[PDB]
Structures are given as structure tokens and as C-alpha cells.
Amino acid sequence: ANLFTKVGQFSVENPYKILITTVFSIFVFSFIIFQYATLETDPINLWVSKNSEKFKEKEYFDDNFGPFYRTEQIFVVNETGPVLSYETLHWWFDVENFITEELQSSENIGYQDLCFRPTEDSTCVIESFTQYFQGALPNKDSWKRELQECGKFPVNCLPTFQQPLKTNLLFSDDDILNAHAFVVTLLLTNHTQSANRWEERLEEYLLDLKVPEGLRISFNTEISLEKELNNNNDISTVAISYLMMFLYATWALRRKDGKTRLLLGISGLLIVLASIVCAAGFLTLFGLKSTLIIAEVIPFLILAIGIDNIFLITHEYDRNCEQKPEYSIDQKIISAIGRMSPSILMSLLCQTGCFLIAAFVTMPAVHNFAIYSTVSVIFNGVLQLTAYVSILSLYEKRSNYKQFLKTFYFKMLTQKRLIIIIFSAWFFTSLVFLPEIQFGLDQTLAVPQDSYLVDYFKDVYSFLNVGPPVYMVVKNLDLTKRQNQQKICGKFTTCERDSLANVLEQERHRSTITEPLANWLDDYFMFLNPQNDQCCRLKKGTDEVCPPSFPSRRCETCFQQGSWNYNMSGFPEGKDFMEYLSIWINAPSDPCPLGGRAPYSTALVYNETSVSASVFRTAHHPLRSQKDFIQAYSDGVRISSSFPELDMFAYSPFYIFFVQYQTLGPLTLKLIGSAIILIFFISSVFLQNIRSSFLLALVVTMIIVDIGALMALLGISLNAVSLVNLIICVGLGVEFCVHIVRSFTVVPSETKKDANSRVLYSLNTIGESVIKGITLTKFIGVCVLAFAQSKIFDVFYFRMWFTLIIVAALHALLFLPALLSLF
Ligand SMILES: CC(C)CCC[C@@H](C)[C@H]1CC[C@H]2[C@@H]3CC=C4C[C@@H](OC(=O)CCC(=O)O)CC[C@]4(C)[C@H]3CC[C@]12C
Ligand SMILES: *[C@@H]1O[C@H](CO)[C@@H](O[C@@H]2O[C@H](CO)[C@@H](O)[C@H](O)[C@H]2NC(C)=O)[C@H](O)[C@H]1NC(C)=O
Ligand SMILES: *[C@@H]1O[C@H](CO)[C@@H](O)[C@H](O)[C@H]1NC(C)=O
Ligand SMILES: *[C@@H]1O[C@H](CO)[C@@H](O)[C@H](O)[C@H]1NC(C)=O
Numbered sequence: 001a002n003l004f005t006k007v008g009q010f011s012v013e014n015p016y017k018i019l020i021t022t023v024f025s026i027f028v029f030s031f032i033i034f035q036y037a038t039l040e041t042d043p044i045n046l047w048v049s050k051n052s053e054k055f056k057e058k059e060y061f062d063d064n065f066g067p068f069y070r071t072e073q074i075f076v077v078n079e080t081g082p083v084l085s086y087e088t089l090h091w092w093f094d095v096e097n098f099i100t101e102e103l104q105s106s107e108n109i110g111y112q113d114l115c116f117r118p119t120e121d122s123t124c125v126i127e128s129f130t131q132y133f134q135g136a137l138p139n140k141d142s143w144k145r146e147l148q149e150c151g152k153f154p155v156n157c158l159p160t161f162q163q164p165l166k167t168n169l170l171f172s173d174d175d176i177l178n179a180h181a182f183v184v185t186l187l188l189t190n191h192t193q194s195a196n197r198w199e200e201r202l203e204e205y206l207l208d209l210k211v212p213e214g215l216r217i218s219f220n221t222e223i224s225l226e227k228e229l230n231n232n233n234d235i236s237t238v239a240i241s242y243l244m245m246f247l248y249a250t251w252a253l254r255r256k257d258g259k260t261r262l263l264l265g266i267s268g269l270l271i272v273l274a275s276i277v278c279a280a281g282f283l284t285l286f287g288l289k290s291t292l293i294i295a296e297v298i299p300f301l302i303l304a305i306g307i308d309n310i311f312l313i314t315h316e317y318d319r320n321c322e323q324k325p326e327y328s329i330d331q332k333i334i335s336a337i338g339r340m341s342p343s344i345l346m347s348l349l350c351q352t353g354c355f356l357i358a359a360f361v362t363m364p365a366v367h368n369f370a371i372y373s374t375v376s377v378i379f380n381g382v383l384q385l386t387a388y389v390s391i392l393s394l395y396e397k398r399s400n401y402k403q404f405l406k407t408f409y410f411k412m413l414t415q416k417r418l419i420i421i422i423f424s425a426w427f428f429t430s431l432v433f434l435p436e437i438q439f440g441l442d443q444t445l446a447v448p449q450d451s452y453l454v455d456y457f458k459d460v461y462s463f464l465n466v467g468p469p470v471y472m473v474v475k476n477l478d479l480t481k482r483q484n485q486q487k488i489c490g491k492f493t494t495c496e497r498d499s500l501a502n503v504l505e506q507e508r509h510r511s512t513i514t515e516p517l518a519n520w521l522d523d524y525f526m527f528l529n530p531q532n533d534q535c536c537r538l539k540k541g542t543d544e545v546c547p548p549s550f551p552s553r554r555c556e557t558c559f560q561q562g563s564w565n566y567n568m569s570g571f572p573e574g575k576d577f578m579e580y581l582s583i584w585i586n587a588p589s590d591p592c593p594l595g596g597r598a599p600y601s602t603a604l605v606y607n608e609t610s611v612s613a614s615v616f617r618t619a620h621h622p623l624r625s626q627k628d629f630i631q632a633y634s635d636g637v638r639i640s641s642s643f644p645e646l647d648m649f650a651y652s653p654f655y656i657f658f659v660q661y662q663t664l665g666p667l668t669l670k671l672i673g674s675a676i677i678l679i680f681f682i683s684s685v686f687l688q689n690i691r692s693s694f695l696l697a698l699v700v701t702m703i704i705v706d707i708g709a710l711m712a713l714l715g716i717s718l719n720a721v722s723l724v725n726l727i728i729c730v731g732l733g734v735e736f737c738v739h740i741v742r743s744f745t746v747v748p749s750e751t752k753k754d755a756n757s758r759v760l761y762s763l764n765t766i767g768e769s770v771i772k773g774i775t776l777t778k779f780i781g782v783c784v785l786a787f788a789q790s791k792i793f794d795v796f797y798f799r800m801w802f803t804l805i806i807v808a809a810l811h812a813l814l815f816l817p818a819l820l821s822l823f
């Protein structure tokens with residue numbers, strides 16, 4: 001507590017060395033940012049913890065079964081009716097073929113060089129209704145009848161890549177002629193930069209595409225999210241915020257006579273700028289990467305809170321001018337610093353601690369923001385206690401100067417009991433609404449409102465009639481043994497009642513994973529059925545695969561009519577299992593439909609003696625909300641635990657982005673609870689009065705509880721961003737109440753020690769400072785976040801922090817005086 005007085009005392013005696021060091025420190029840090037600063041843009045690096053189980057499972061899936069396809073999805077929409085017409089078919093057939101056959105990317109790399117191919121000799125997989133006709137424009141008359149039958153019976157119109165396409169994948173309505181949209185999905189197995197270049201060319205192509213009148217297209221490339229997420233220009237917004245603060249600072253920092261002090265106003269804002277630069281340049285040396293949050297929020301948050309102590313010290317120093325006039329300018333600043341240091345330091349520590357508590361959230365972008373805010377707040381506090389004190393001493397010495405309201409503080413203290421009843425009811429009403437807070441972070445808010453991804457995300461929720469695929473990865477299961485393979489199959493009478501196939505079939509009518517499971521092990525055993533005389537043919541008298549050109553009577557089935565049984569009697573085991581597995585996983589699907597090459601060539605990781613890992617593919621039903629995604633993620637985790645005897649997990653591409661919600665609620669209670677107890681201990685050490693510290697913590701709890709209830713009423717979902725913002729609201733609320741509580745606790749001997757008198761003296765001392773130096777300054781800092789290009793910075797930052805200011809100010813200015821006079 002005395003180091004601030006010692007630090008401020010050193011600053012007044014050595015202002016130029018402090019000021020020279022400050023600019024030198026700023027210059028070097030700004031140089032580091034200029035040179036070594038890096039911006040993190042990858043969504044996975046921003047939202048996914050590298051140490052999460054889902055991330056590690058994604059690494060295993062990528063290494064063993066390749067990274068999931070790079071998906072480029074296009075929606076073509078007829079908002080007021082059906083989209084299918086020969087005019088639109090003629091247009092899209094030309095556009096669709098150009099994209100996949102003629103759209104070179106520079107480097108002369110097209111779709112054919114990057115597309116997914118089920119087999120090396122197959123064609124590109126294009127998930128579109130144009131593939132029902134093999135990418136050839138149908139007749140002007142028969143396209144309606146042909147398209148309907150193809151939707152009804154996909155097998156009858158198999159595409160050139162031999163994978164049937166269901167209408168729920170290609171359209172918005174199973175009634176194809178009435179569907180308002182049709183979906184086009186492009187899959188790329190290439191994961192090098194050449195794929196990135198082509199997707200950029202594809203993205204530029206679609207933005208410049210002339211859609212027919214009455215139609216509309218939304219799309220998404222694998223690079224779209226990264227490009228759109230980190231595509232913002234808010235330089236003017238920051239300047240506007242700092243100009244409004246400059247105008248307010250000039251008015252607030254003018255002398256009691258009414259004379260403006262421009263240097264003090266400018267210096268206070270320059271110190272805020274230095275705090276951001278010094279923190280950003282400091283964290284660069286540690287290799288920390290900034291993100292969109294740093295560019296879009298940090299200048300506003302630090303501006304909102306980095307200017308408060310300037311008013312508190314200057315206003316207190318102004319008070320030291322009228323009171324104790326014989327004191328010199330140096331002594332006035334030191335005395336003002338000394339008495340206001342305990343409240344400033346305690347609030348600073350609460351700000352520091354809450355940010356560090358918010359750093360326990362594992363989202364790197366959110367964790368990065370908390371760490372950046374922690375350094376900025378510490379840098380801001382040091383600068384205010386050294387740089388501003390040096391400037392204030394320099395300015396005041398050079399410019400020598402000779403020098404509602406209280407009525408409300410009495411009228412409101414007449415309604416102490418009524419005030420407590422109003423706020424007590426508000427807190428109790430708020431508790432009822434806490435269970436009503438919704439989880440999630442809508443993706444439309446994350447991207448700029450003008451982005452083309454906003455339309456695409458709406459189209460997915462509106463028109464996509466399929467859900468993300470789910471892969472059941474089973475590893476280290478010795479499938480050469482009958483017992484182990486009985487734990488997977490579901491087509492045979494000896495398979496366990498709780499086998500992978502059996503259990504998952506039950507979940508189809510009980511969970512979000514409602515699609516049939518592609519069981520390769522069942523297909524492999526079905527492929528061995530002697531009834532399938534065209535499957536598993538061996539040269540007679542030899543254990544060699546029958547050549548496809550070989551005619552009948554020159555080969556024999558791997559199994560005789562009496563060996564294969566539906567109770568798995570005679571099924572291959574040991575080395576025989578792997579012997580015929582090579583035959584099955586290489587057989588084409590043309591003569592034998594049960595051949596596992598096309599469907600399961602990449603579904604198995606194996607060698608000549610064992611299958612080390614394998615994949616069983618299913619999918620969720622269409623997920624059309626944050627609740628659906630959270631429930632879908634919950635189902636995957638729950639089902640993975642349904643097989644304690646299997647080293648297995650469920651993989652979906654979106655799982656990494658919804659890890660937090662599995663434990664968000666318990667984490668919110670733990671982190672916010674930890675923050676409030678931290679307030680109690682920090683307050684107790686400084687206030688040295690557990691009663692006052694308890695009431696301060698109690699009031700902060702009511703503010704946070706009320707904010708949480710208002711989040712439910714205001715439609716602010718709970719996620720990593722909201723949780724950290726709400727954790728910051730804990731620190732922000734403390735600053736609203738710390739000075740009121742401390743002034744009540746410590747009063748001069750001249751004033752009466754009565755509780756009512758102490759509350760009045762507190763309101764007649766810093767009540768103005770709380771309004772001018774905390775409340776109004778906070779609003780100006782974050783007000784422009786309401787107009788941010790991305791609605792996340794308005795929904796989850798402005799709305800929460802704007803609500804914090806109102807709720808905290810009401811509790812600090814009305815309830816807290818009543819809660820102090822009584823109790
Ligand atoms: C630096 C600040 C601005 C935070 C950045 C966080 C984003 C990288 C996160 C927040 C919400 C996330 C989204 C939440 C939900 C989804 C849906 C889900 O997508 C699918 O299942 C595919 C089909 C569909 O889009 O519905 C997974 C990706 C996505 C877009 C997520 C992508 C990553 C996002 C945009
Ligand atoms: C991703 O696509 C690139 C092409 O853009 C492939 O790289 C080519 O590979 C061939 C054969 O090795 C070379 O002759 C070309 O010079 C490469 N071109 C470029 C631009 O690098 C790459 O193989 C693809 N990725 C995978 C996994 O197949
Ligand atoms: C879009 O829907 C309206 C509603 O019937 C329809 O009249 C119009 O033709 C559609 N657009 C196209 C390009 O067909
Ligand atoms: C499996 O079925 C065959 C005939 O269908 C029968 O001979 C055999 O005993 C059955 N297996 C077992 C373990 O009973």
C-alpha cells in the first residue's frame with residue numbers, strides 16, 4: 001500500500017527521467033510490435049484447446065484416416081418459392097461444371113487436382129443434384145420427371161463416382177420440385193496450400209458470380225471462415241472512442257474554477273495508449289499471439305478502465321487544494337496518492353486477479369485476451385502511478401493556480417428499508433432466471449454482419465437436411481479373435497447384446513446420431529458368404545484371388561456352403577481373418593457389391609497380421625441451433641462411454657469447437673465463485689473489516705447474479721467469451737463499490753462515527769468520483785462496441801458491460817448506502 005506512495009513520491013521528484021524512460025519503454029515496445037508481432041487467425045488455434053481430449057482425438061483421426069475432407073458448400077436459394085427450373089438448371093449446370101473442371105487457381109491447379117476420389121481410378125466426388133445426370137444438362141422436358149425418380153431412388157441414378165446421393169443431402173425439401181434451395185458440396189482430399197489457393201479462387205469466383213434474378217447464393221470454403229473471421233477495419237472506431245474520452249476528460253479534469261487542463265486530458269489518454277502498446281510489445285517477447293479480440297476489444301476495455309484512476313487522483317488532488325492550502329503541489333499530490341492508494345491498489349489487484357481467473361478458460365483466443373488484459377491493466381496501473389504523477393507535478397508547478405447533489409444522498413437514505421426490499425426482491429427474482437441462461441455462441445455473430453458467411457450460416461440452419469458425419473474410431477481391438485469381433489457386429493446371432501452395432505442401432509431412436517452405421521466388419525463377413533458366389537472367389541485348389549476376367553467353374557468361393565453360418569461358426573480367425581481381409585478390402589464393387597475397397601479402403605489401418613484401428617461412419621441428424629450442436633456433442637461423448645471394453649471414441653469435425661459446453665455450467669459456478677471469494681479475501685486484507693468486506697462481496701454477488709439473469713432476459717448466451725466477460729464484470733463491479741465501502745469504513749475523526757453518518761460522508765466524498773471517474777468513463781469506453789462490425793463485440797461485450805455499469809452503479813449508489821447504514 002505504501003509502495004504507491006513511495007512510487008508516486010519518486011515520480012514527482014524525478015518526472016523527466018520517469019517520462020524519458022516511459023517514452024523509451026514505449027518506443028522499444030512499439031518497435032517489437034512493429035517487427036515481431038504476429039496475429040493468430042486460424043479458428044482452431046483461437047477456439048480449440050491443444051490439450052483437450054477432442055483435439056487429441058482429432059490428431060489421431062487425421063494421422064490414421066486422413067484429415068476430414070475440405071468441404072466447399074454452396075446454397076442456391078429461391079426465397080419465395082421453388083428453386084428448380086430449367087433456367088436455373090441451365091445456369092447452374094454451366095457454373096457447376098466450370099468450377100470443378102475449368103476453374104484454375106493460378107499455379108494451374110484445378111478441382112480435379114484436389115478433389116476427393118473414392119478410388120484412384122474414380123472421378124471427382126461432387127455432392128450435387130447435377131450429378132444425378134452425370135453433370136450433363138437434362139432435356140428441356142424430362143428433367144423434372146428424371147430428377148424426381150432419382151431423388152426417390154438414388155441407386156437408379158448413381159453418379160460417375162458410384163456413391164448414391166440422397167435428397168436430404170442435395171436439397172432443402174424431400175419434395176424436390178418444391179424445395180426452396182439445393183445444396184452443392186465439394187470435397188477435397190488435398191490439404192496442402194494448393195487447396196488454399198484454389199479455395200481463394202473459388203471464393204473470389206462466387207462473390208463475382210451473377211446469380212439469376214429472383215435467386216440467391218450463399219457459400220462457404222474451407223478458407224472462408226479464417227478469411228471472414230479476421231476481416232475487419234475498425235481504426236476509425238478506436239479514434240472516435242478516444243476522441244470522446246478526450247472531450248470528456250477535458251471537461252472532467254478542468255479545475256473547480258472552470259479552467260481546462262488540456263495536458264492532463266491528453267496525458268491520461270496517452271497513458272492508456274502506452275499501456276496497450278507496452279503490454280502488446282511485452283507479450284510479443286514471450287511469443288504470445290494477438291487475435292481479433294485484442295484488436296477489437298482491448299483498446300476499448302483498457303480505455304474504459306485505464307482512465308478511472310486519473311480522475312480519482314486528480315479529483316483528490318483538487319480536493320487537496322481547497323483543504324490544507326498551505327501544502328505544496330508536491331505534498332498535495334503525494335497526500336492525495338497516499339489516501340487513495342489502498343482503494344486503487346485493491347481495485348487494481350481485483351482487476352488483476354479476475355483476469356487471471358478468467359485465464360483458466362482453455363479457449364486460446366479468450367485465454368489470450370485475459371492474459372493481454374492482465375498485462376495492460378498492470379502496465380496502466382504502473383504508468384498512472386508514475387507517468388501521470390510526473391505529468392501532474394510538472395503541469396501544476398508550471399501552471400500555478402490559486403483557487404441532485406447532497407439532497408439526493410439524504411432523500412435516498414430515508415428509503416433504506418424500501419431500497420433493500422427493492423434490491424432484495426431483484427436479487428431473488430434474478431436467481432429464478434439463472435437456470436434460464438442458454439449455452440452457445442452463434443457463429444453468425446462471430447463473423448462481420450456484412451460477411452457472406454452470415455447468409456451461408458442461415459442457409460445451413462434453414463436448408464441443410466443432413467448433419468455432420470460421426471466416425472466411431474475403434475483402436476487396439478484384436479479382431480482376429482471371435483470374442484472381440486462379436487463386440488462389433490450386429491448382423492449375427494452371437495454378437496453381444498451390447499455390441500457396437502447393436503448399441504448404436506438403439507441410439508438412432510434415442511439420440512442425435514440417427515443415421516445407419518457403416519459397419520465394415522459386418523460387410524467383410526457378409527462378403528465371405530458363399531451365397532455371394534461372386535464375392536471372395538479363389539482359384540480352385542489354390543489360395544489365390546480369382547482374377548476378375550477368369551470365368552466361372554475356374555474358381556471357388558473362399559468358404560463352402562456349410563462353413564459360413566449366421567452364428568459366426570466357421571468365420572475366419574487368427575491369420576485367416578487377415579488373409580481374406582486383404583481380398584475383401586481390395587475387391588471392386590462392380591461384380592461384388594460387398595467389396596470393401598471403394599467403401600472401406602481408407603476406413604481401416606492394418607497390416608498383414610492385425611487391424612490396428614478402424615472407423616465406423618454414421619452421422620447426426622440436422623443440427624439447426626447451438627442447442628442442437630451441444631446435444632449432438634453430448635451424444636457423442638455419452639455413446640463413447642457405452643463401450644468400456646473398447647478403446648474407442650467418436651469423431652466429428654465440429655466436436656473440437658463445442659468441448660467447452662460439456663462443463664461450462666460447472667466452470668461458470670467455479671470461476672465466478674472463485675472470483676467472489678477472492679474479492680472477500682483481498683477486501684478483508686485491505687479493508688481490515690470482514691463485515692464491510694462481506695457486504696462488498698455480497699453486493700458484488702447480487703450485481704453478478706442480476707447480470708446473469710439479465711443475460712437470460714437480454715438473450716446473451718453463456719460461452720467462453722461470456723464467462724470471461726462475466727468474470728471481468730466481477731472485477732468491474734468491485735471498482736464501483738470499493739471506494740464507497742472504504743470511505744464508509746475509514747472516516748476522519750471529525751465526522752461522527754454513526755453508521756448513517758459514515759455512509760453520508762462516503763457519498764459526500766467520492767460519490768461524485770464514482771459517477772464521473774468510474775461510471776461515466778466506463779460507458780464512454782465501451783459504448784462504441786455496440787457498433788462493432790462483428791455482433792459478438794456488441795452482444796457479448798457491450799451488452800454485458802453496459803448492463804454491468806447500470807446494475808453496478810445502482811447497487812453501488814442506492815443499495816450499498818442502504819446496506820451500509822443498516823447492517
Ligand atoms: C477471436 C474471437 C472472435 C473468437 C473466435 C471464435 C470462433 C473461431 C468460433 C466461435 C463460434 C464457432 C462456430 C460455432 C459453430 C459452428 C458450426 C459447426 O459447423 C458445422 O457443423 C458445419 C455446418 C454448419 O455450419 O452448421 C462447427 C463450426 C462452427 C461454424 C464454429 C466455427 C468456429 C467459431 C466461429
Ligand atoms: C496437393 O496438390 C498439389 C498440387 O497443387 C500436389 O503437389 C504436386 O505433386 C506432384 C507429384 O508429387 C508434383 O509433380 C507437382 O509439382 C506438385 N505440385 C505442387 C504445386 O506442389 C500434392 O501432391 C497434393 N497433395 C497430395 C497429398 O496429393
Ligand atoms: C423465385 O421464387 C418465385 C416464387 O414463385 C418464383 O416466381 C421465381 O421464378 C423464383 N426464381 C426463379 C429464378 O425461378
Ligand atoms: C450355427 O449354425 C449351424 C447351422 O446353422 C449349427 O450347426 C451350429 O451348431 C451353430 N453354432 C452354434 C455355436 O450352435
Ligand SMILES: *[C@@H]1O[C@H](CO)[C@@H](O)[C@H](O)[C@H]1NC(C)=O
Binds near residue numbers: 606608610
Ligand atoms: C502390425 O501392426 C501391429 C499393431 O500396430 C503390430 O503390433 C505388428 O508388429 C505389425 N506387424 C507388421 C508385420 O507390420
